[PDB]
Symmetry: C2
Subunit: 499 residues, 2 copies
């Protein structure tokens, strides 16, 4: 029909109710029971049975309107993701409260109502509330979309409340997200880790390699950068003696947006004094295996990697997972030998040309950037049926990772991928301040062609114990455990191009 | 000379490297933590050694002393607990190096790993008796003694290492958030995350922070509150929803203001103002007893140099209507409309006559100034509610069902400081835009802290927001009163500060 005319008529209805003295937005309706609790109490009720002496006050949203004549009105009432039917029969209406037809003729799809009624099942077995009075609590002034109208449109992301009301799978996705975070918090808390809050506005944005957001505090007259990671202050806390410390919160990176990149996303980083790379590998295998089984009762799950049209693949989270050394694998699959140093002009041009030969995009072509593109194009999709680790990244890729205790030029680093998407980053922590500043200076010369924080370097000088730290991408993990191809689908309000 | 001392320790590190020793080993497997060590061998007779039991233990050295050529003593601390180290020349593994040369290297602050056996000293001190002591990470600076300055805020790791009280404060902070989360979760509430970057910063009266996303060429405001997206979730059918996280306000800094701080907002469909007062009394009373085993706490409102006072969180708490109480204390009549030039001019004259500082003197700012100077310190021995704020002051609160011009709003104070804000939510879409249109009139007068209108929020209300009660908590300020702190800086690990 005409949505605009429909909204204007509903707006006039609201005003006309006010002119007649009715308040269409009452202050308080005292509910006796919720819709889920009502399904629970009366599901085992007789086919056709009534409990007319049990009077209840319930609320919900009308999501379907139908009629069987003037004296039998049928509705769908939804709440907390669950639904019952409303059977309004003239025979049971409390005529002292008003005229039957004038009450229910007013109801529209979407209206929030409060119902005083009694429980029963229809002749057909359909669990129902039988009102004796229905009261409008909050009207829906627009036409609700069809499920079809939300299918391939971004109304889901710009009007998420419509998606939550119309699509049952939407509520389930975000319930799983909270369950994932709850399980991660308990998993760490049971292991003695201490949750903290580190600043989101900082003089320097470090702990990763990404362009930051900038903002300004007026009263201090200070430019501040939003955190791109929580890594650096969490290590300062380890120096402070919080030997098991973690944080779950937002980080911000001023980068490209796509199906795996939201400018603000949720990370968890934990730091574990006296642990090393081996402890972090075992932690990763323990956590993901127990999380998947906590949620699905099994280690195998299906994931529509190629969209809902193509058939799904199966991801087996049974430990252990394979470990692939980045340099050795690139060397193996390319039939090249990457001599050290990796940032020598010899190895750079060697990586540049094997980039050019395989028709890949040359990144600023730094040795770190080239190695990333090589692993991205030759390793990261090695496994799709199972998560897997890429390990032992070179030092020039890992300015904060401790040097490999036996393999020169490499670090004790790990990255876990699921279907070619990084969800985990961990390594033995670099705690030698002299080796740390040398890593900071090389990035600055790489900059001239993240910033070094003197406060972090100073804290290393008071003694950082041997430590292992780990970071998780919560949204990306939720994607795979909710069968979603876009990060927009697991964030309630994702960052959108403005309308 | 600390600069000389750091220079010597740095040279020691390099010379240790030149000789053949790694001063920062990769891995040492700890057998037992220091808390487990105390808890397991507290039941030891004075002077007994369990020399058959060989343990690997780690910690930070915090004191170094010596008796002769063959005995050396240390404090080893970890996880806020401390044990003694008795390095005796009798038990030293000489195959690893010279006894004196091994322990001469150790300085206060060094992280070490110890292989040794448990025992108590002759005096009764629980101790680890090393057979080998390995340097794991040196402290290259002199560690100060028990740091009572700005150092605590810029070098929090030092404050955590040296001051026992610092660790307990932040432990209590995390305990408070844990209790809050469990409290809401067992009541059926659903935790969510909403955007911290937005086209508009609504939900409160505060100046925002602005930032810019390069690839989209789009200015974005940091959220000043979580009200608006959360209520949109109520529209979406999440009838019990909440969020615990950071918000950002571009304001002045003081003992109760950090530019970023932690808030909890929860929204509860089919509840109202009265359910919210009930929740506040239940939550605060149970929280205080959870932490303390009593509803009464001590707080040094006037600093440690002055006598403390008792705060009784036993419910119920007093309720004070703002306009009526101001009118009573001020002996004037504040007529509606409160934003009329007449009522504004009188409130200004009340502030001038009383030698209080005039605020942009908007009606809402004037009322709040009058409440702060005449109402909010009425009760210090107990928390209390200021209630029934005018429409002008609360553009998102539902109008009072019996009192014209007021709303069904409450804010709870402790020792004059706001820690809670709550009200029956305005859910009439046509009243909300009127409230939005009115606050832009105040924004035209220079009110940088006037809430902007979110058309996406107004649209969501047109799809039907059920009757709802919402509530906000200032987590940091609550932590202050429950850890006996007079500054918000003392309950945030790294408060906002200028560069060194
Ligand atoms: C903290 C990290 C630990 C494990 C690796 C992932 C990597 C990652 C990067 C990223 C960058 C964006 O600009 C936007 C995003 O959404 C993401 C994301 O989701 O994940 C997170
Ligand atoms: C979400 C609110 C609900 C309950 C009332 C407090 C008020 C409050 C405001 C504030 C403003 C700042 O600019 C810095 C801060 O630190 C704070 C703070 O701590 O508390 C929070
Ligand atoms: N800060 C890292 C995560 C932790 C890495 C191990 N310290 C990142 O942004 O990916
Ligand atoms: N947004 C409010 C807290 C919630 C008030 C009740 N909806 C504030 O910043 O104070």
């Amino acid at each position: 029909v005409d949505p605009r005319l429909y909204f204007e008529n509903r707006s006039k209805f609201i005003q006309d109710q006010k002119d007649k003295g009715i308040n269409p937005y009452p202050h308080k309706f005292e509910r006796t029971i919720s819709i889920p609790e009502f399904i629970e109490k009366y599901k085992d009720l007789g086919n056709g049975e009534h409990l007319e002496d049990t009077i209840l006050n319930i609320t919900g949203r009308i999501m379907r309107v139908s009629a069987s004549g003037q004296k039998l009105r049928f509705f769908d009432l939804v709440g907390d993701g669950e639904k019952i039917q409303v059977l309004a029969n003239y025979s049971f209406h409390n005529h002292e409260k008003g005229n039957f037809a004038e009450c229910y003729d007013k109801i529209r799809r979407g209206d929030i109502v409060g119902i005083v009624g009694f429980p029963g099942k229809s002749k057909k077995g359909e669990l129902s509330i039988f009102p004796k009075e229905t009261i409008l609590l909050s009207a829906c002034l627009h036409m609700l979309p069809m499920k079809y109208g939300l299918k391939d449109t971004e109304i889901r992301y710009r009007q998420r409340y419509l998606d939550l009301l119309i699509n049952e799978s939407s509520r389930h996705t975000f319930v799983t997200r909270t369950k994932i975070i709850n399980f991660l918090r308990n998993f760490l808390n049971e292991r003695g880790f201490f949750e903290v809050e580190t600043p989101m506005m900082n003089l320097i944005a470090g702990g990763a390699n990404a362009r930051p957001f900038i903002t300004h505090h007026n009263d201090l007259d200070l430019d501040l950068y939003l955190r791109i990671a929580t890594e650096l202050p969490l290590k300062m806390l380890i120096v402070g003696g919080i030997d098991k410390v973690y944080e779950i919160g937002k980080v911000f990176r001023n980068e490209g947006i796509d199906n795996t990149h939201n400018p603000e996303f949720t990370s968890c980083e934990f730091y574990w004094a006296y642990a090393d790379y081996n402890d972090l590998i075992k932690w990763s295998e323990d956590f993901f295996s127990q999380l998947v089984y906590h949620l699905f009762g099994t280690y195998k799950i299906s994931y529509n990697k190629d969209g809902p049209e193509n058939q799904p693949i199966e991801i087996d989270f049974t430990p252990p997972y394979p470990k692939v050394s980045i340099v050795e694998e690139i060397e193996k699959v390319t039939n090249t030998i990457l001599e050290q140093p990796f940032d020598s002009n010899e190895t750079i041009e060697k990586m540049i040309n094997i980039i050019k030969e395989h028709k890949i995009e040359l990144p600023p072509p730094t040795a770190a950037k080239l190695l990333d593109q090589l692993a991205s194009h030759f390793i990261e999709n090695k496994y799709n049926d199972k998560p897997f680790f890429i390990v032992e990244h070179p030092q020039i890729m890992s300015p904060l990772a401790k040097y490999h205790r036996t393999k020169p030029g490499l670090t004790e680093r790990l990255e876990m991928f699921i279907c070619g998407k990084e969800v985990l980053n961990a390594y033995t922590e670099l705690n030698d301040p002299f080796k740390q500043k040398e890593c900071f200076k090389l990035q600055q010369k790489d900059r001239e062609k993240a910033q070094l924080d003197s406060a972090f370097c100073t804290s290393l000088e008071y003694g950082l114990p041997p430590t292992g730290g780990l970071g998780l991408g919560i949204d990306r993990i939720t994607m795979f455990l909710t069968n979603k191809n876009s990060i927009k689908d697991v964030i309630l309000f994702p960052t959108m191009r403005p309308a």
